[PDB]
Amino acid sequence: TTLLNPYFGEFGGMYVPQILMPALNQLEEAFVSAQKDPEFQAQFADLLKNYAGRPTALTKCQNITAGTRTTLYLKREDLLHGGAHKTNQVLGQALLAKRMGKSEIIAETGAGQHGVASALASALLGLKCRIYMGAKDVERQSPNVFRMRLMGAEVIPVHSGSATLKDACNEALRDWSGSYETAHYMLGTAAGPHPYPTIVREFQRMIGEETKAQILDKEGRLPDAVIACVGGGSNAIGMFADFINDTSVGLIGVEPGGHGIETGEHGAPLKHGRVGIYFGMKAPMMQTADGQIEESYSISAGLDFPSVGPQHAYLNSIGRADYVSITDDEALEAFKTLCRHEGIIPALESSHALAHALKMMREQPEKEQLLVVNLAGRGDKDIFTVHDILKARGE
């Protein structure tokens, strides 16, 4: 029994042990209540604006589209407090926790951006924050781990299994099933069991709402496409949502192609995986022929999720959104191009989305088209990776 349909078509659901269902039902009711509560919406807006810096700019690229008939805007979630879009929805989920009388936050993180976002939100709102992180990720992202601890959060390395985001997700779930009377599980993407895909979209949809208002103000029409990288699906669904009924507007989600789809070393389950049931949802997954979950490879840590949000699988299945992949090397080329042409250092994750807009304009340079790329974070965190790559290749 739920207030809302837990499925997007054939995808989604609530595939959790019975012990966790009251936690999900509580959360769904609190969200539905919050959505109808002007006081929740006012507090959320107050935080989004005065603490996180919204609205974010919609930047027209000046140089990168030279020699083509493409106009390209960047939705600047890189200027949000924390440096990425993760901050938007942690503020809403932190207020939901307070609505539910919870004083503790449980969070998972792979690349560290959602962990840092959870920690800063918990610091501001006075919640005790504990973050689960695969031990491999803890070793690989010691700067974000230090950021989390600076803000008072407890960071718990997870050694179980592959010691990566999957096992961190599972440990956070074990904890919540025992602590949900006082703790809220702050899931960091538009995936997992209902109601999380719905909540995370609604707490990210200001991305696309702002984009729509800004692009109408600036160009007098809607974009021909909005483009967004797809790790678990939250920044993309946040950009897409307000355009879903504007069926002239293309929705393009970009999965990580890694070393190439044909190598198998990629993060593109929506187009190249197989539907399975894991992490509380029915959705496309990287898995073995025997049904074991595999890992998502990408140069960009934030695109490491081995599955995808169920609404993206649904939007794809019905033809409303199209999904493509972009390899490590194309994402790196777009990273370099934005730096030199626009003075903006993009997150390697969002560089996948920029890489696909660059392909769109370069493949058809006389095509008149108005594109928005969701620049979901800044790439300061990526400069050591990009440095060591360019040096390895003698550049």
Place this chain on the structure above:
Amino acid sequence: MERYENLFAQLNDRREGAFVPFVTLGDPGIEQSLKIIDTLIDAGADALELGVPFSDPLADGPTIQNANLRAFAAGVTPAQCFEMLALIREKHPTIPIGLLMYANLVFNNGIDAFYARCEQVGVDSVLVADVPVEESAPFRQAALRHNIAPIFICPPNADDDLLRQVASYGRGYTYLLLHHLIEKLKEYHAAPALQGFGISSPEQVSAAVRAGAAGAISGSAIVKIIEKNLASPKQMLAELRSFVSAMKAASRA
């Protein structure tokens, strides 16, 4: 699911509860596991709960997580598990055999195909750990179509709607994770309740039967004997013998 029916009627005539050990199939290896399981039945196990190794066993704690890891490190696949199960059934025609699955393994090659293969090898019941009552319909239907009992977990935070759901849709046994809850399960004509999640010594087996449960399931405690003795198979089998016989003796009272 007839085997649970037959088991509980026999135990009722003997005025006994059921003692049910859990192990992970293929832990520490295939031949070792088969010998463990035969020792469990020899020492007086009434039924078996068998886990299929899976990459991300959420609902499982630390001791079984390492059993799962040991079976993984042994290359035990779902297909080899089905072969093991057929042999276990062929050795032991009456003992009820329950699987502990995760949803993706059941879904992976088709839900109906999975339960068809369970029927073929002689499985009596399946609990899918990450499928709640609210998602259970396709699994329940495929189970019943293949004469498999669908096992539901009745958790500590259950309420009256859940009790009625579990009593309506479950067969074979109810997996009980207190005295009032068994009362309602009985009033609701639920499948006989087996208490799990805490059963590590004979006193707890006796307590569960005294409370009105039909028996108890012991997981970690059994697997801890396996872990503790991985270097001495003979010692492992001796300690499993002694532990199971003691736990089973406790179900008489």
